[PDB]
Structure formats: structure tokens, C-alpha cells
Design a protein around this motif. Structure first.
Motif, PDB file in Angstrom:
ATOM      1  N   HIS H   8      10.953  18.216  12.692  1.00 48.75           N
ATOM      2  CA  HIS H   8      10.345  18.092  13.995  1.00 48.75           C
ATOM      3  C   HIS H   8      10.415  19.391  14.772  1.00 48.75           C
ATOM      4  N   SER H   9       9.434  19.554  15.641  1.00 50.84           N
ATOM      5  CA  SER H   9       9.351  20.702  16.511  1.00 50.84           C
ATOM      6  C   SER H   9      10.293  20.544  17.701  1.00 50.84           C
ATOM      7  N   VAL H  10      10.307  21.571  18.548  1.00 52.73           N
ATOM      8  CA  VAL H  10      11.147  21.576  19.743  1.00 52.73           C
ATOM      9  C   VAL H  10      10.777  20.423  20.669  1.00 52.73           C
ATOM     10  N   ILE H  11       9.494  20.321  21.005  1.00 55.55           N
ATOM     11  CA  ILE H  11       8.989  19.269  21.884  1.00 55.55           C
ATOM     12  C   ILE H  11       9.189  17.885  21.290  1.00 55.55           C
ATOM     13  N   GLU H  12       9.088  17.760  19.970  1.00 56.90           N
ATOM     14  CA  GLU H  12       9.331  16.475  19.330  1.00 56.90           C
ATOM     15  C   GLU H  12      10.716  15.983  19.711  1.00 56.90           C
ATOM     16  N   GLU H  13      11.708  16.877  19.738  1.00 54.37           N
ATOM     17  CA  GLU H  13      13.023  16.447  20.185  1.00 54.37           C
ATOM     18  C   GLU H  13      12.913  16.017  21.635  1.00 54.37           C
ATOM     19  N   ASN H  14      12.161  16.776  22.422  1.00 55.17           N
ATOM     20  CA  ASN H  14      11.994  16.434  23.821  1.00 55.17           C
ATOM     21  C   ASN H  14      11.300  15.088  23.986  1.00 55.17           C
ATOM     22  N   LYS H  16      11.220  12.492  22.012  1.00 55.00           N
ATOM     23  CA  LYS H  16      12.195  11.443  21.768  1.00 55.00           C
ATOM     24  C   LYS H  16      13.169  11.384  22.935  1.00 55.00           C
ATOM     25  N   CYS H  17      13.556  12.565  23.447  1.00 59.00           N
ATOM     26  CA  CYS H  17      14.476  12.631  24.577  1.00 59.00           C
ATOM     27  C   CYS H  17      13.920  11.925  25.807  1.00 59.00           C
ATOM     28  N   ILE H  18      12.644  12.147  26.171  1.00 54.32           N
ATOM     29  CA  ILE H  18      12.145  11.384  27.317  1.00 54.32           C
ATOM     30  C   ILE H  18      12.175   9.901  26.979  1.00 54.32           C
ATOM     31  N   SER H  19      11.801   9.542  25.745  1.00 57.35           N
ATOM     32  CA  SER H  19      11.821   8.131  25.379  1.00 57.35           C
ATOM     33  C   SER H  19      13.247   7.597  25.456  1.00 57.35           C
ATOM     34  N   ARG H  20      14.203   8.366  24.918  1.00 61.35           N
ATOM     35  CA  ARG H  20      15.619   8.004  24.976  1.00 61.35           C
ATOM     36  C   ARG H  20      16.109   8.001  26.415  1.00 61.35           C
ATOM     37  N   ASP H  21      15.714   9.026  27.168  1.00 55.79           N
ATOM     38  CA  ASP H  21      16.096   9.156  28.566  1.00 55.79           C
ATOM     39  C   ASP H  21      15.544   7.981  29.357  1.00 55.79           C
TER      40      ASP H  21
END
Lengths: 129, 334, 66, 69, 138, 69, 197, 60
Positions: H8-14, H16-21
Motif C-alpha cells: 500500500h501507498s502512503v495515503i492508503e495507510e491514511n 484506512k486511518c480515517i476509516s479506523r479513526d
């Protein structure tokens, strides 16, 4: 000749059941059309005493009856009002329980903020458990 | 001359003890003081055993055993599974009745059958199951409220029409409440004879309930809010006791406030030799809250500081009147 | 014939029922006509004194539930 | 008051002498903030609700304290 | 029943890793491909699974619409209550069953009748014909 | 009609008729939660208007058979 | 005789409508007096005590009106569970058209009740159902009545049918020596009043 | 789009992070409408790293 008289109350009553189930459904969107009815029949039959179940097939009388339960605020009639909240609480309860199960990492940080106000005795209860 | 005689299902333990109790608690009459022993076993067993989720297995057993037949099997095999897995998942912390789930399945077969009046075998199957859940749809808990809530109002209904002005003129309103028949009158007339006995005893229902009420429920507090209004010489403490309920919502009355002093104290106290809770010590001696219930209970708790701290405040809370110029804790033989 | 304490017991409940028969029959007077009777006459509390062999049987009988 | 009056009811029952100058002493040892004369009405409402009962009880003397400021 | 359905998986140029479709079809030899409750039910319910995944539904249509029928138990026993039987063209009032003959379908939810005496004979006026054959109604 | 969200009570008045497609397309089944149907003493409803029911059920047998019995 | 149409009020109805006599009470009197709910209302109309039931106090040539009559029965299982609670268990679910112990079920608790109601439904389908308080063991006595078409109704003596085994009347006795002489003059007239009325 | 279950790319982590957040805010948000559920939720909420997690509340 008398179908109109019948139909008026009948149509209006179809709506109240529909109206309340949307309220329960509003209380908990995952709920199916069908099961809310049983709950409603049961809440209908329960409040007035199982003895008053039969009344359900009289359109007119329920029109008068349902409104009093819903309309009379802060009486001993705010039973369904208390009841719908429980499903809302239950559906809400299921989510809080479910998210940590699905997402246990959120628990620790979620609790510190979530636990941040409750009574100090209740703070004591966490220590006992 | 004298003689004394020692001479003498969980589904029923709930229901049975209650049936005994509604005859007890309709106002039959209490023979002696000794009664006040009888109710604690009855009522702690009840309150505690009504939370106990092994009741519903026997309650879903017993209706569904005598109506195992006449049943539409699609809905039956689904519901009969889930009692089995009411049974498998029992003793979990998070077990609630699956009301809508059992109800919805039937409404799968109500969705297709119920439009047709073909249904009087079915009526007793689409009612009998919804009636199982009807004891227990909101769990033991809404209901265990409701039932005690009803019976308390049962005490009330009888005894509210009975007295409104004075006994004599009022009895004609009683005469007139049931003009046609007087058998209903007889339980009425019979009930109010021992009200004064009854009146302390109403407290019992609320007392262990209120032991863990403190944030209970408005529809109930509504019924409760009626209780402060009680306006008679005998029912004036009890009326005032509503206030005891209405305040303990703030300042509670059970082991949690035993926990509260425990909490505050062990948290507050330094637990070095310093032990500087002087503001709290004066707060103990200028305490809006009364702190003699458990604080004396703890200055002999197993915790050497709580010995020390609680003990000297107790001294100080005794001799608040005198002038103290020295108080040293010693720690002797051991 | 009886067993003494059952005797004393059922004695007590024989005397009771009789005392109770009066109390029941006293209810039927006043309420059928509408007399506002004093509570006391209905008699749960019953006091049975039954002297057998000179040594008394000491009893009370209190109606505790219908 | 009722519990006390029940006990004192037993006191009547147990022994009777026509008691005369019955006393109620209440020490409110907390320290609240209020004024004196609606407090005086407060104790009026208190004592008044029981009327004849006082005379049965033969109540002639009562003292309370309550710390205010 | 007059309807058949399968799930099919195949590799296609457009979906070289594979694609699914649903094929439903009438059998014109079974009740001129009419739509009985079983035909309606397999089709509907087959689609219900298809729809859950969002995937296509293919229907082969060759049919005569909804199932039609009359209650056989009655065809061989209804009688016509003629204004005059000796001349039918004077009209009829209702159809009926003799009482012995009625006393047989009566147990079986076939018709609804009321006993009547008319034109000398005792008749069972057919008010509703229910029909032992399932699937021929609304 | 599938999107209706509140009660619909349908009544066929006397001497009218509603057949086949019109019945099929307004049956309460699409949304049982919200549809209801009512019928007059004088109403009717079917899969097929008379010629087509008859066309199937006006084979050799029905004319002769009905006279014959 | 007993059973079959012995308790079917339609038999004298159609027979009387067709001018055929019935050696028993006419349709109206047979339903209003053979049916326990209706008969208890008639008994109540006559001023005769009846055991506690859903229709205590009810009364109105006699006819039991559906509105008065509808209080004595429990239209469904739902109506039955509620009736059983006022009198207090144990109760009896009884088919009102049941004769000779037909259509009767004993209920010890609210949990057994639904099937006992369902059993009565299966035992006597179509018959309304009521619930009544099971009296304590007492003497079950009967008064034989004989009434003409002019208002004369008499008492002869009685029969004791307290003695039952598995719902079957086992022993009968004539006269009723158990009752008090004063009580017997009243009992003969009450039985007679109901018939004459 | 093409590499399913790849890196995954940088934003892909992000993302998921907004989804997780976003799920995390809901529990916080959920208690706001119904704070009484908070306390009871904790016993159930703690099933993860539980002894450390109970300790953290006590420290605070």
C-alpha cells in the motif's frame, strides 16, 4: 354503504403502526419490517394487558388508543417511549461492544476518554472487576 | 402446658414465592415482628435470582414443553435451536433475550400465513411464543421493575380510594366504587386494616432495589415522584422516604459508598508518614456527607495506612469539640 | 384418634374455623347491607384455650393468607 | 419522628402517667446557609402537620439546632 | 415444477479469470410454460440469491402467464339451479351440490355452501369454490 | 409503487373489474408492510380476463360435460 | 338424552320453527341455561349465587345479550391468561358448550395455561371458553326441577354428586341429609325460582 | 487498483486511518448521547490488552 366509515379508521390505523415502526426503526435502522410488527403487537398486547389483544382488529378504537400512549407525555403511558429507547440503547450497545471485538486496539484509548466522567464510586467498580 | 412444632422448580421459585408474596403484600395482616426476618430470604433470593439468567431456560422450557406441538416447524426449529443456545451461551456477561430474533422468525411465517385467518392452531402458536418473550422481551430487568412497580401501585390503588377525607364518608365512595358486587370490596376492606404494618414494609421493596437504584429510570421516577406527595401521619416517613430515594440518586446508600470512602480515602491519602489529608480531615469534620458509616469500618481495615489515617480522623471526628495539641500514631506490639 | 400436636394444631384450626365462621358471617351482615364495620371483627388473630387432662393446650391461630 | 413516636407509642402502652413536657432535641451538626424566619415557618409547618397527635404525645418542649451562616 | 435454474461459472474474453450468470427458462412442454406458484417461486427466489451479489440474471421467456384452473371435485358434482330445468334458457340462479354429495367435499374446504330448499329440491348453493388443486388461484 | 412508505388501502368499487396485469402490478406483495387491498360485494380480480381463462377452459369437454351431467 | 344434540340449542330451534316438539327446554332456554356462562347469568338473573368467574354480577322470557354474555368468556388465549389471575390459581378452563366433563382443563400456573386453553380449543373447537375459580372441596348437590308451560316449577329432593373419580360422577345419594333444615327450605325455592323465572 | 493485497501507498495507510479513526470517534460520540453505557462498556471494552489497559485508567 358503511365501508367508508370502516375504511377511514382502517387507513389511519395502518399508518400509526407504520408510523411507530419507523420510530422504532429510527431507534434501530437494521430492523426488518416484519419483526417490528411482532414487537408492536406484543407491545400493543402487553401494555393494555394481553386481554386487550383482540381490540387490535377494531380500526377505530386503536386510533384513539395509540395516540394516548404516544401523546400523553410523562404519564404512566410513556412505556413504549421507554421501550423504543431500549432497542436504541441495545443497538447502540451492540455497536460499542462489537467495535472493540472487531477493533480491540481502540479499546484502551477509547475507555480513558469514555470513562472520564462517571461517579467516583463507579470508578471504584472498575477496580473491583 | 406448652408446645412448639418444627414442622415443614426454580421457574416456580420465582413465581411461587411471588404468589405467596402478593397474598402477603396485598395487605393480609402480619402476625408478629418475626415477619421482618422472613422477607430478607424471600427478597434477596428474589432480587438476586431475578437477575440470574438461568430462569428463562426454565421459562422457555415450560410453556414450550406443553406447547411443543400444534407448532409450525420452520419457526419452531429456529426458536428451539436458540433456547438450546440460550443454554449454551448462558453464564455470559452479555446475554440478552433474542426477542426480535425469535419474534422475527415467526414473522417470517406470519409474513406468509398471517394474512388469512387460517390461524387458530397458529394463533396459539403465534401468541404463545410472543407471550414467552412478553414476560422477558426487555429482559428480566424492565419487567422486574414493572412487576415490583405494579404491586407497589397495587398497595396504592386500594389504599388511595380508601382515604380521601375521612373513613366514614369515604366508605360510601367505596360502596359506590363497586356498587354491583361487594366481593371486590371485601379484599379492599380487608387490605387496609394493617396499613401501618404495611407502611414500613413498602420500604423493603424499594430498600434493596434502591440499594442499587441511583440512576434508574424516568417512567419509574414519575411513579416515584408521585410518592413524595404522600400526605398522612402514618405515611409521612414513607412519603419522606421518597426523598431518601430522591437524594441517594446523588449520595448513595450501599457498598458503593463503602467503595466511595474506600475510593476517595485510599486515593486521597498520601500513605507515607506525611499523611497530609488535613483539608479532607476537616472535610470529614465539616462534611456535608456523613462519614461515620464506613470510615469507622475501615480504621480497622487490613491496610496499615487506613488504620492510621481513618483512626486519627475518627479521634478528631469525636473530639472536634476539644483542642488537640498532639496526636502521634504509634505502631506497637506489632 | 389424633396425634396430640396435630390434635393441638387441627384443634387450633378447628376452633379457628369456628371463630372464623363467626368473623366471616359478621362480614356478610355489614357489607351486604352496607354497614361500615370496624376492621377488627374479621379475626385473623384467634386465641384457642383447650384444656386436655388439666394441662392446657396453649394456642393462637392467625389467618396468614387466604 | 414516626419511628420515635412508635417507640414512644410503646412508651404509652408500656407505662402511662400523663406525661406533660415532652422534649424533642435535634442537633443538626452540619453547617448550611439560610435565614432564620422562613426556617421558623419551616418548623411551624413541621410541628403543625401533627396536631392532636402532639396533644396525645403531650408535646410541650422542642429544641433543634442547625448551624447556618 | 415448470422452471429450472442453475449457477454457471465460465472464463470469458472479457473476464479471463471468470464470470457468473444466472439462467432461468420456461419449459413450454410443462403447462404451456405458464407461471404457477412453483414457477414464480423458483424464478423469484433464484433471483434473490443472484441479486445478493449484484450479478446478472438471464431469463428465457416462452410462456402463457399465470396458472389457471377450476376445482375438479366440483366439476363432476355441481348442479345448476335453473329457473326451470326443463328449459335452461329461462335462466339459472346458482350452482349447487346435493346434500349427500355436499357432505363429502364439505369436510375438505372445497366450496362454501348454505343448505337451501328451492323448487322442491334441497340444494347447497355454491357461494365460493375453493378448489383442492393448489396453484390455480390469485 | 414499490417505493411507497405509508399505508395504501385499495378498494375495487361495485361492478368494476381489474384483471391480469393490472392486478399483478398492484398486489400488496411488493410491500406488505405498507399495502392493503379491500373488495366490494360487487368486485372481481384474476390472472386473466374471461376470454383467455375460457380459451384454455373452453376445450371440447366443458360445454358437453356441463349439459351432460 | 345426553351428548350429541342434547345440548345443541339449534335442535329445538329448527324443530320448534317447523312445529316439532322437543322433550326438553326450548332452544332459547337451553342455550341461556345449558351454557355455563349464559346459565350463570340466568342464575344471577334469578339471584342464585355462583362461584367466582369472569362474569360475576351479570344479569339482564330471557335472552343473554352478547354484550353481557361477552364478559363471561375469554375470546382468546390472551383473554384467558388475564381472567385466571384475578380469581387466583388454581383455575379451570371450561368449554361453555361442554357437557358431561367435556372441554375442561385444570390450570395450576400461568405457564401451563396456554396449552390448556389450546387443549380446550382442540377438545371443543368453535365453543367459547371461560375461566372460573375452582372452589374448595365441598359438597356438590343437585336439585331435581320439574316445570310446566304455565309458570309452575317445583323441587322434589336432591342428589349429591360430590363423589367423582377421574371426572366421572361415581356415587349419588338422595336425600341431602348434610344440609341444615333452615338451609333446605331456601335451597328448594332458589332452584324453583330459576326454572319459574 | 490492480494490485489487490499488494503493498500500500502512503495515503492508503491514511485512508484506512480515517476509516479506523472514524470508527473510534463513534464510540466517543456514542457515549455522548448515552454516557451511562460508558462504565458498563469498560468491562466488555477491556478484552484486548486488559491488565495494562485497566492500569492506564488508574494512573489517570
Amino acid at each position: 354503504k358503511t365501508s367508508r366509515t370502516f375504511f377511514y379508521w382502517r387507513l389511519r390505523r395502518l399508518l400509526l403502526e407504520d408510523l411507530v415502526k419507523k420510530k422504532i426503526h429510527n431507534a434501530n435502522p437494521e430492523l426488518t419490517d416484519g419483526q417490528i410488527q411482532a414487537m408492536l403487537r406484543r407491545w400493543f398486547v402487553e401494555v393494555e394487558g394481553t386481554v386487550k389483544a383482540y381490540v387490535w382488529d377494531n380500526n377505530k378504537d386503536l386510533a384513539e388508543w395509540l395516540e394516548k400512549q404516544l401523546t400523553e407525555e410523562d404519564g404512566v403511558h410513556s412505556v413504549i417511549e421507554e421501550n423504543i429507547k431500549c432497542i436504541s440503547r441495545d443497538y447502540v450497545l451492540k455497536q460499542i461492544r462489537s467495535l472493540v471485538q472487531a477493533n480491540p486496539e481502540v479499546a484502551m484509548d477509547s475507555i480513558i476518554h469514555m470513562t472520564q466522567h462517571i461517579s467516583p464510586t463507579q470508578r471504584a467498580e472498575v477496580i473491583r472487576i | 402446658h406448652t408446645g412448639s412444632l418444627p414442622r415443614i422448580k426454580l421457574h416456580r421459585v420465582f413465581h411461587y414465592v411471588l404468589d405467596n408474596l402478593v397474598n402477603v403484600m396485598n395487605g393480609y395482616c402480619l402476625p408478629d415482628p418475626f415477619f421482618s426476618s422472613k422477607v430478607k430470604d424471600w427478597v434477596e433470593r428474589l432480587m438476586k435470582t431475578l437477575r440470574d439468567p438461568s430462569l428463562p431456560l426454565l421459562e422457555l422450557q415450560d410453556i414450550m414443553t406443553s406447547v411443543s406441538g400444534r407448532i409450525p416447524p420452520n419457526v419452531e426449529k429456529s426458536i428451539k435451536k436458540e433456547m438450546a443456545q440460550y443454554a449454551s451461551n448462558i453464564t455470559s456477561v452479555l446475554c440478552q433475550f433474542p426477542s426480535q430474533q425469535i419474534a422475527n422468525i415467526l414473522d417470517s411465517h406470519a409474513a406468509t400465513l398471517n394474512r388469512k385467518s387460517e390461524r387458530e392452531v397458529f394463533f396459539m402458536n403465534t401468541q404463545s411464543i410472543v407471550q414467552l418473550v412478553q414476560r422477558y422481551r426487555s429482559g428480566i430487568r424492565g419487567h422486574m421493575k414493572a412487576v415490583v412497580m405494579d404491586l407497589l401501585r397495587q398497595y396504592l390503588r386500594v389504599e388511595t380510594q380508601f382515604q380521601n377525607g375521612h373513613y366514614d364518608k369515604c366508605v360510601f365512595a367505596l360502596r359506590e366504587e363497586n356498587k354491583s358486587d361487594m366481593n371486590t370490596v371485601l379484599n379492599y376492606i380487608f387490605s387496609h386494616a394493617q396499613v401501618t404494618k404495611k407502611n414500613l414494609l413498602v420500604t423493603m421493596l424499594i430498600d434493596q432495589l434502591c440499594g442499587r437504584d441511583p440512576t434508574l429510570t424516568d417512567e419509574l421516577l414519575n411513579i416515584l415522584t408521585e410518592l413524595t406527595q404522600l400526605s398522612k401521619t402514618t405515611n409521612a416517613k414513607v412519603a419522606l422516604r421518597a426523598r431518601q430515594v430522591l437524594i441517594a440518586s446523588h449520595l448513595p446508600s450501599y457498598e458503593l459508598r463503602h467503595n466511595q470512602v474506600e475510593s476517595i480515602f485510599l486515593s486521597a491519602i498520601d500513605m507515607y508518614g506525611h499523611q497530609f489529608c488535613i483539608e479532607n480531615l476537616q472535610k470529614l469534620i465539616l462534611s456535608e456527607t456523613s462519614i461515620f458509616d464506613v470510615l469507622p469500618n475501615f480504621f480497622y481495615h487490613s491496610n496499615q495506612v487506613v488504620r492510621m489515617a481513618a483512626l486519627e480522623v475518627y479521634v478528631r471526628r469525636a473530639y472536634i469539640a476539644y483542642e488537640l495539641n498532639s496526636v502521634q500514631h504509634r505502631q506497637l506490639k506489632d | 384418634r389424633p396425634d396430640t400436636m396435630l390434635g393441638v394444631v387441627c384443634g387450633a384450626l378447628h376452633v379457628a374455623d369456628v371463630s372464623l365462621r363467626n368473623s366471616v358471617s359478621n362480614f356478610l351482615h355489614s357489607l351486604e347491607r352496607g354497614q361500615v364495620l370496624p376492621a377488627h371483627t374479621l379475626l385473623n388473630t384467634v386465641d384457642v384455650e383447650l384444656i386436655y387432662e388439666g394441662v392446657k393446650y396453649v394456642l393462637k391461630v392467625t389467618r396468614q393468607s387466604p | 419522628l414516626l419511628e420515635a413516636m412508635d417507640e414512644l407509642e410503646v412508651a404509652f402502652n408500656n407505662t402511662n402517667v400523663r406525661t406533660d413536657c415532652n422534649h424533642i432535641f435535634l442537633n443538626f451538626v452540619p453547617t448550611v446557609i439560610m435565614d432564620p424566619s422562613k426556617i421558623e415557618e419551616s418548623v411551624r409547618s413541621m410541628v403543625m402537620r401533627y396536631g392532636s397527635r402532639l396533644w396525645k404525645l403531650r408535646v410541650l418542649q422542642a429544641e433543634l439546632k442547625i448551624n447556618i451562616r | 415444477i415448470g422452471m429450472v435454474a442453475w449457477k454457471m461459472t465460465f472464463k470469458s474474453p472479457e473476464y479471463p479469470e471468470g464470470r457468473d450468470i444466472i439462467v432461468i427458462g420456461n419449459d413450454i412442454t410443462y403447462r404451456i410454460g405458464s407461471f404457477g406458484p412453483q414457477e414464480d417461486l423458483l424464478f423469484l427466489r433464484a433471483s434473490e440469491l443472484a441479486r445478493a451479489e449484484g450479478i446478472p440474471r438471464i431469463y428465457v421467456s416462452a410462456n402463457s402467464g399465470a396458472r389457471i384452473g377450476l376445482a375438479e371435485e366440483i366439476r363432476h358434482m355441481f348442479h345448476v339451479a335453473w329457473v326451470d330445468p326443463e328449459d335452461p334458457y329461462k335462466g339459472y340462479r346458482y350452482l349447487y351440490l346435493t346434500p349427500q354429495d355436499y357432505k363429502r367435499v364439505s369436510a375438505l374446504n372445497s366450496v362454501h355452501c348454505e343448505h337451501v330448499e328451492d323448487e322442491g329440491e334441497s340444494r347447497y348453493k355454491i357461494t365460493d369454490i375453493i378448489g383442492k388443486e393448489e396453484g390455480i388461484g390469485p | 409503487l414499490r417505493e411507497c412508505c405509508q399505508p395504501v388501502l385499495v378498494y375495487i368499487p361495485p361492478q368494476a373489474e381489474l384483471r391480469g396485469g393490472s392486478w399483478v402490478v398492484i398486489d400488496s406483495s411488493i410491500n406488505p408492510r405498507h399495502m392493503e387491498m379491500y373488495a366490494d360485494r360487487e368486485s372481481r380480480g384474476s390472472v386473466l380476463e374471461p376470454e383467455g381463462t375460457v380459451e384454455i377452459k373452453f376445450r371440447r369437454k366443458d360445454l358437453v360435460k356441463t349439459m351432460r351431467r | 338424552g345426553w351428548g350429541h344434540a342434547s345440548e345443541n340449542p339449534k335442535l329445538p330451534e329448527l324443530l320448534l320453527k317447523n312445529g316439532i316438539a322437543f322433550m326438553g327446554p326450548p332452544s332459547q332456554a337451553m342455550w341461556a341455561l345449558g351454557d355455563k356462562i349464559a346459565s350463570s347469568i340466568v342464575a344471577q338473573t334469578a339471584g342464585i349465587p355462583t362461584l367466582p368467574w369472569s362474569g360475576s354480577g351479570l344479569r339482564v322470557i330471557l335472552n343473554v345479550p352478547q354484550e353481557l354474555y361477552e364478559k363471561g368468556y375469554v375470546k382468546d388465549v390472551d383473554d384467558g391468561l388475564q381472567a385466571a389471575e384475578e380469581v387466583g390459581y388454581p383455575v379451570m378452563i371450561k368449554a361453555s358448550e361442554g357437557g358431561g366433563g367435556k372441554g375442561i382443563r385444570k390450570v395450576n400456573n400461568a405457564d401451563d395455561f396456554p396449552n390448556l386453553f389450546r387443549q380446550v380449543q382442540a377438545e371443543v373447537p368453535g365453543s367459547p371458553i371461560f375461566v372460573m375459580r375452582l372452589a374448595k372441596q365441598s359438597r356438590h348437590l343437585e336439585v331435581q326441577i320439574l316445570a310446566d308451560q304455565y309458570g309452575n316449577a317445583i323441587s322434589l329432593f336432591g342428589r349429591d354428586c360430590s363423589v367423582q373419580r377421574r371426572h366421572q360422577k361415581i356415587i349419588e345419594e338422595a336425600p341431602a341429609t348434610i344440609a341444615t333444615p333452615a338451609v333446605f327450605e331456601h335451597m328448594e325455592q332458589c332452584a324453583v325460582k330459576l326454572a319459574k323465572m
